[PDB]
């Protein structure tokens, strides 16, 4: 009777990084921050794992919504697709600082995890390098779409993800699409937390009943 929002963190991001984000929401929305298990993994296989653990947390009748920042955007989209095919009620999908899924698969994911030689044109760089491998191996067919509205959010000074690469998220939905630009870089949300959350909450409760 109260919608539940699933929070998908960025590559290297934990559920603890999204405590401040979740705190900004009122009691009208339930928040479940996903914690990732962590040259063997892809976005769809990780989404299959997340979906298996996540499905029992909400009843088939329960209204659910998804939020993803950066890599979390690709995973949240993939888990939302699985929820829809399973017959769940997906209200909306909120994608932040994440490019729209590409249609081709790049064979640059067969490089060794010691990409230090190729990167030099250390342990702290491993999570970012593993994400590049998962992103270059991630593709989605043009026909694969959600039947719920998509809300895109981007930072004006983000070079990793721009309005141009976030715009094709409109083709990943059968319904409404909206894109909002906030001042900031790849982690713009830290400085725009009240306005971003009030926007997500308003839209989640709007589609809820
Ligand atoms: Ca805050």
From TrEMBL:
<feature type="domain" description="Thioesterase TesA-like">
    <location>
        <begin position="9"/>
        <end position="204"/>
    </location>
</feature>
<keyword id="KW-0378">Hydrolase</keyword>
<dbReference type="InterPro" id="IPR012223">
    <property type="entry name" value="TEII"/>
</dbReference>
<dbReference type="GO" id="GO:0016787">
    <property type="term" value="F:hydrolase activity"/>
</dbReference>
<dbReference type="GO" id="GO:0008610">
    <property type="term" value="P:lipid biosynthetic process"/>
</dbReference>
<dbReference type="GO" id="GO:0016874">
    <property type="term" value="F:ligase activity"/>
</dbReference>
<dbReference type="Pfam" id="PF00975">
    <property type="entry name" value="Thioesterase"/>
</dbReference>
<dbReference type="InterPro" id="IPR001031">
    <property type="entry name" value="Thioesterase"/>
</dbReference>
<dbReference type="InterPro" id="IPR029058">
    <property type="entry name" value="AB_hydrolase_fold"/>
</dbReference>
<dbReference type="InterPro" id="IPR020802">
    <property type="entry name" value="TesA-like"/>
</dbReference>
<keyword id="KW-0843">Virulence</keyword>
<protein>
    <recommendedName>
        <fullName>Thioesterase TesA</fullName>
    </recommendedName>
</protein>
<comment type="similarity">
    <text>Belongs to the thioesterase family.</text>
</comment>
<keyword id="KW-0436">Ligase</keyword>
């Amino acid at each position: 009777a109260a919608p539940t929002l699933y929070i998908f963190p960025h590559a290297g991001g934990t559920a603890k990084d999204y405590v401040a984000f979740s705190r900004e929401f009122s009691a009208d929305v339930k928040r479940i921050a996903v914690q990732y298990p962590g040259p063997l993994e892809s976005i769809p296989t990780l989404a299959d794992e997340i979906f298996a653990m996540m499905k029992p947390s909400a009843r088939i009748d329960d209204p659910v919504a998804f939020f993803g920042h950066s890599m979390g955007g690709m995973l949240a989209f993939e888990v939302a697709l699985r929820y829809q095919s399973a017959g769940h009620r997906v209200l909306a999908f909120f994608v932040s600082a994440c490019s729209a899924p590409g249609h081709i698969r790049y064979k640059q994911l067969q490089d060794l995890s010691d990409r230090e030689m190729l990167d030099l044109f250390f342990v702290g760089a491993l999570p970012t390098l593993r994400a590049v491998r998962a992103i270059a191996g991630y593709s989605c067919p043009p026909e694969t779409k959600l039947s719920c509205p998509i809300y895109a959010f981007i930072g004006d000074k983000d070079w990793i993800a721009t309005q141009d690469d976030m715009d094709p998220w409109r083709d990943r939905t059968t319904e409404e699409f909206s894109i909002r630009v906030f001042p900031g870089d790849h982690f713009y949300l830290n400085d725009n937390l009240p306005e971003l959350v009030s926007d997500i909450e308003d839209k989640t409760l709007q589609w809820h009943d």
